[PDB]
Amino acid sequence: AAPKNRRTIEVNRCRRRNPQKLIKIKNNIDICPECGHLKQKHVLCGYCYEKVRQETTKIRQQIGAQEGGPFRAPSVETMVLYTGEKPSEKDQGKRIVERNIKRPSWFT
Amino acid sequence: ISHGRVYRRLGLGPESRIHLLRNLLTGLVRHERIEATWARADEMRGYAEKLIDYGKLGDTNERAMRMADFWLTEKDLIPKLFKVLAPRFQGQNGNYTRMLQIPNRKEQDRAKMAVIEYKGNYLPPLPLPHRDSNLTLLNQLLLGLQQDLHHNQ
Amino acid sequence: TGRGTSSRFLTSVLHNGLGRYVQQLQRLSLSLSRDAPSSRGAREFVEREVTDFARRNPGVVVYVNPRPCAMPRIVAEYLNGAVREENVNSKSVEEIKSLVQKLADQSGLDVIRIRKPFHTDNPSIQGQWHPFTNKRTALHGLRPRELR
Amino acid sequence: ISRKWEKKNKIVYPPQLPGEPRRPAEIYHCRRQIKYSKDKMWYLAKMIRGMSIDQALAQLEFNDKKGAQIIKEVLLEAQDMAVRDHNVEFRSNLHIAESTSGRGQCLKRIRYHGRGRFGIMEKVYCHYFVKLVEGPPPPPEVPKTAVDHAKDYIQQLRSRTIIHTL
Amino acid sequence: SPTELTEMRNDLFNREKSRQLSLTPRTEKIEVKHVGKTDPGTVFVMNKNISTPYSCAMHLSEWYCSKSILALVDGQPWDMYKPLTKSCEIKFLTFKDPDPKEVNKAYWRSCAMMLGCVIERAFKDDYVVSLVRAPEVPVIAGAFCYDVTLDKRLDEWMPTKENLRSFTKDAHALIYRDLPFETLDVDARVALEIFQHNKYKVDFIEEKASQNPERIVKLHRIGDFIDVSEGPLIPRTSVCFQYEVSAVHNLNPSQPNLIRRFQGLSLPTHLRAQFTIWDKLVERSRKMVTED
Amino acid sequence: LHSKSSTWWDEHLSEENLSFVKQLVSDENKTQLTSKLNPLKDEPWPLHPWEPGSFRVGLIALKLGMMPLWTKDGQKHAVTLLQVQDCHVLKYTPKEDHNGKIAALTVGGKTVSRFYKPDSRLEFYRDLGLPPKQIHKIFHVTDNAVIKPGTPLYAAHFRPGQYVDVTAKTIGKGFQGVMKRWGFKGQPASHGQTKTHRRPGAISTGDIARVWPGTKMPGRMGNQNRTVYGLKVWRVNTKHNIIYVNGSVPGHKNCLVKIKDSTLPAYKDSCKNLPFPTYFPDGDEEELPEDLFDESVWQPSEPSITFA
RNA sequence: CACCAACUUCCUAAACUUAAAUUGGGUUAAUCUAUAACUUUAUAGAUGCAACACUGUUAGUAUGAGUAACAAGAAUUCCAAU
Ligand SMILES: [Mg+2]
Ligand SMILES: [Mg+2]
Ligand SMILES: [Mg+2]
Ligand SMILES: [Mg+2]
Ligand SMILES: [Mg+2]
Ligand SMILES: [Mg+2]
Ligand SMILES: [Mg+2]
Ligand SMILES: [Mg+2]
Ligand SMILES: [Mg+2]
Ligand SMILES: [Mg+2]
Ligand SMILES: [Mg+2]
Ligand SMILES: [Mg+2]
Ligand SMILES: [Mg+2]
Ligand SMILES: [Mg+2]
Ligand SMILES: [Mg+2]
Ligand SMILES: [Mg+2]
Ligand SMILES: [Mg+2]
Ligand SMILES: [Zn+2]
């Protein structure tokens, strides 16, 4: 079936400017207290989450170097230490990961 | 009609769905924090919880060992489950995982994203949301109300 | 064409005929060429008819400007502020003479559709009709079926 | 091709006299050749009409369309030049007066079909225009009240004349 | 006639502003640095005695302007619309900070000040109402209170439920107008001239002037109404969303004159409360609050 | 931003107040429910006697499920279980206001949470001093049978042996084709049919050049109000307020239904034997048995049936 | 026991009498040349001398339509990695 007539610019304006087809405004945008960048209420902050993932990559890069190959997963717990820190008694017999930089303020 | 169907349709079929979930579960055990699409991580969350239940049964149980063998493709991780993760969650009765929604992926498909992890890991803490302190204006008024009712019978 | 054009009501500039009639045309300008076939008829008009027209109408100031020209033109201006312009290219003396007389009689008001031929500011002497005219009153001003 | 939007930034008015309201500033900015359809860009340009700069930038940051990112960068440059070149005091004191999309110069190519046939393909482009005006956004629209509606109706009845008579 | 007092008081209030404004000639630049957590290291160069903390928030973005209720200039709370004086360090406080104690008091004072303005213009012009003081009560108390002494002819009359509702409708109309909280620090001499009629006001003014090394007293005006203040106040009256005049209690030891204390509650737009939660808090705000 | 933002009850609640507010609301429900337990000692409206042509109020119940049942002849009947749960009378209209010849009463049931409701509804319930209800419906009642608002109703309002009417929303099946929706035959599977198996045939005749209004076509099915007429009552459980009704009732389990006595011609004036205004346990003239039965019903714990 | 109703007819001003192939006559848009004119004109001599319509030719832009249709296995410590 083919169109029997051309549709006019007036009719076309009514189809594509209908309120059903317009972009809706958002009411759930807020500012992040820690960084001051914007976020949605039900979603994690992107800027703050970006910090954590960067550190996570560094730790995992170090973990890869120590193991030296695949199929080398330890059977004991893991822990991370930064320069100026030494293992406690409770830390005995647990894999230790060493980072050159100092302990990040946010990391506890 | 899909009344009462508790599974999503994923992959190339029923068998393909299991294999996709198995790969995500194996990655979670090794790394303990993972990013997937929100729908896929939500489907895999259930299996992650039940795996910690078989681990609790113990190394010597024949059924537990068979189940662990199937669901962990890399075999260096079966010792980890029975001797690291299972001891960690001895006290709790559940709620071993934490899952949160992440900003949409910036890769031209704009997928809804999530991050799923096991509680108690060694990684830097996630930036979770905190409730308001009791020092705020609304909290104080409710605290005042609580004290009066408690003290006055 | 009526729906495609503007319209107005019949009027006069300043109540022209009440106390005294005043002629609305006040200025004429005519431009000529000394030696150009197109403006020959206008030249004869200046030779014969221009002076006589000025005397009969003393309230109009007339300007005649010979200069090198391609089309002879006439400009008429009125008291209310209207301006009208006419080309006189290659016209006879009789044509120009009759054209000038029309301009004198006109008032500068626009020539467009006039809604009505007649205009009155005091349409009624005995009072305009309203529904209560021709309706009898009633005793005590009782509306129908009111008991009292 | 016409480039008039650019030159609008170079108008100079004479100094204002002491007894006169302070004239607000105006900024015109655009980006010309963009690999995006103008029909699609319209929906984005329409949304931010009338809003302040901060509210506009907030809504753009969480839209998934490719056009949203391009509009945001144009908005940021307009804000920067407003303070730097047009003597605007406060960054936040700005609202979007005008925003619209326009057609660009396009390209023609071939699109293949299944019996040795073909069709004509267009690679489409568009422009984006904005005008920034200093000051808080003007107040929104208030629908007519019931009393306001009635007052118009009496006015209509009072205007009646006796038609086609002396 | 009360109208006379409002007119003359405004005139003196306006005159004092002009005098201080004329005192500052030309423009002087003051370096003020942002010490808050976010956007750290920004430096605003501002005009002395004209620019305010709110103008600083204007430079950054509109999120600061809407959400910031107070500022800490060198560790002291400053009204958002109160002009700055010298180079300093600045920080902005909001209702949701971890320690909003300072903000809570400032909001609490402003609501009471609104309550007093409603009282004076509510009653018939015949009777005489004089405002005595605004007590300082912790938010835990459950309501903000205002003390007022009414006319002798009213000593036998207690407000009905419809009367209390009328006061709330008046208050809600004051919020709709969205008026700023103006601020003045003026020598005690001018304050006494502005409150000579109110004996209670006069003595209070003396107490505050005595405490400070100089005779500086804090005056605040919303619309026509003027009053002395214990501290900083909310930038505007639009901050409030929920407002209620709970009840009125007659103080027993009131032989010479009958002192009636009006109690109310309010919540800001930022911290709205659900329907049922609001009801419970209101009922607990109808019980007499002692000043401790 | 100087613009709108949305909130919900939990947004600003702190850790301690979160649990406290939950407990505070729960207690408020209990206090308001106990207060209404004594209607007869709360200025009840006058109680008129039964007259021919009288109509009585009904109840709102929740659909539990089904189970089997047997009669003294050994015939087996499937039955559905309806539980009355916090049913009160809410509002009364006089005959003239309702615009019907008869008056009307509104009933609510199944207490619900207060947190996610509009203010208008909460204000309406605060006036009546009751916690909100999930659903309201209207019943046509005569003047003699009018009951004061705020009076609880119970399952013993019905008694075994009477027929009843039930109405509820049916199960929703979504957008469906003509074969399932209207039982159209369809087309053959083989013998050369080309992409026409489950489709409708011709809509109408060619002459009219249009489609008649009301033509049967694909569309959304289910999720509509339906009524079942003439269902007998087999037994009542006073302790748990359970009614047993013959046969099937529309809707899924855990769905609210409307129960009223039958309007069929045969059972025109059976209301005389039943409690005329309603059943009041507050009167406490006699305590009812835990289980009420019908004579034909074979109760459990009776000796095995012998068809002697 | 009448009224209403067609430029038929009368009245003020004018006019001087009834579909179409084909047939007889008065003007004129545009451009060039001769001779003039000088904000675009005159008398003559000329011609590739006038397009709402040929499923006309060429170029441009719409409609159908933002529609039909098109595409990259998973996680990570990263695309000649595991
Ligand atoms: Mg239409
Ligand atoms: Mg489902
Ligand atoms: Mg095309
Ligand atoms: Mg059966
Ligand atoms: Mg369904
Ligand atoms: Mg078949
Ligand atoms: Mg087939
Ligand atoms: Mg037809
Ligand atoms: Mg004729
Ligand atoms: Mg013809
Ligand atoms: Mg030709
Ligand atoms: Mg053609
Ligand atoms: Mg198109
Ligand atoms: Mg279509
Ligand atoms: Mg489609
Ligand atoms: Mg498709
Ligand atoms: Mg593929
Ligand atoms: Zn953040």
From Swiss-Prot, chain A:
It comes from the Eukaryota. One of its GO terms (biological process) is mitochondrial translation. MRPL32 precursor is processed by the m-AAA protease (composed of AFG3L2 and SPG7), which cleaves the N-terminal transit peptide. Cleavage by the m-AAA protease takes place prior to assembly into the large subunit, an essential step for mitochondrial ribosome (mitoribosome) assembly. Proper processing by the m-AAA protease is dependent on the zinc-binding region within the tightly folded C-terminal domain of MRPL32: zinc-dependent folding halts degradation initiated from the N-terminus and triggers the release of mature MRPL32. GO terms for cellular component: cytosol; mitochondrial inner membrane; mitochondrial large ribosomal subunit; mitochondrion. Coiled coil: none annotated. It is found in: Mitochondrion. Zn(2+) binds at residues 32, 35, 45, 48. Keywords: Metal-binding, Mitochondrion, Ribonucleoprotein, Ribosomal protein, Transit peptide, Zinc. GO terms for molecular function: metal ion binding; structural constituent of ribosome. Component of the mitochondrial large ribosomal subunit (mt-LSU). The mitochondrial ribosome (mitoribosome) is a large ribonucleoprotein complex responsible for the synthesis of proteins inside mitochondria. Component of the mitochondrial ribosome large subunit (39S) which comprises a 16S rRNA and about 50 distinct proteins. Belongs to the bacterial ribosomal protein bL32 family. This is Large ribosomal subunit protein bL32m.
From Swiss-Prot, chain B:
Belongs to the bacterial ribosomal protein bL17 family. Signal peptide: none annotated. Keywords: Mitochondrion, Ribonucleoprotein, Ribosomal protein, Transit peptide. Disulfide bonds: none annotated. It is found in: Mitochondrion. It comes from the Eukaryota. GO terms for cellular component: mitochondrial inner membrane; mitochondrial large ribosomal subunit; mitochondrion. The keyword Iron does not apply. Component of the mitochondrial ribosome large subunit (39S) which comprises a 16S rRNA and about 50 distinct proteins. This is Large ribosomal subunit protein bL17m. Pfam families: Ribosomal_L17. One of its GO terms (molecular function) is structural constituent of ribosome. One of its GO terms (biological process) is translation.
Swiss-Prot record, chain E:
The keyword Chloroplast does not apply. One of its GO terms (cellular component) is mitochondrial inner membrane. InterPro entries: Beta-grasp_dom_sf (IPR012675), Pro-tRNA_synthetase (IPR050062), TGS (IPR004095), TGS-like (IPR012676), Thr/Ala-tRNA-synth_IIc_edit (IPR018163). Coiled coil: none annotated. GO terms for biological process: mitochondrial genome maintenance; mitochondrial translation; translation. Residues 28-94 form the TGS domain. SUPFAM superfamilies: TGS-like, ThrRS/AlaRS common domain. Component of the mitochondrial ribosome large subunit (39S) which comprises a 16S rRNA and about 50 distinct proteins. PANTHER family: LARGE RIBOSOMAL SUBUNIT PROTEIN ML39 (PTHR42753:SF9), MITOCHONDRIAL RIBOSOME PROTEIN L39/PROLYL-TRNA LIGASE FAMILY MEMBER (PTHR42753). This is Large ribosomal subunit protein mL39.
Curated annotation (Swiss-Prot), chain F:
GO terms for biological process: mitochondrial translation; translation. Its main location: mitochondrion. Keywords: Mitochondrion, Ribonucleoprotein, Ribosomal protein, Transit peptide. It is found in: Mitochondrion. The keyword Protease does not apply. Pfam families: Ribosomal_L3. One of its GO terms (cellular component) is mitochondrial inner membrane. InterPro entries: Ribosomal_uL3, Ribosomal_uL3_bac/org-type, Ribosomal_uL3_CS, Transl_B-barrel_sf. One of its GO terms (molecular function) is structural constituent of ribosome. Belongs to the universal ribosomal protein uL3 family. NCBIfam families: L3_bact (TIGR03625). Component of the mitochondrial ribosome large subunit (39S) which comprises a 16S rRNA and about 50 distinct proteins. This is Large ribosomal subunit protein uL3m. The gene is Mrpl3.
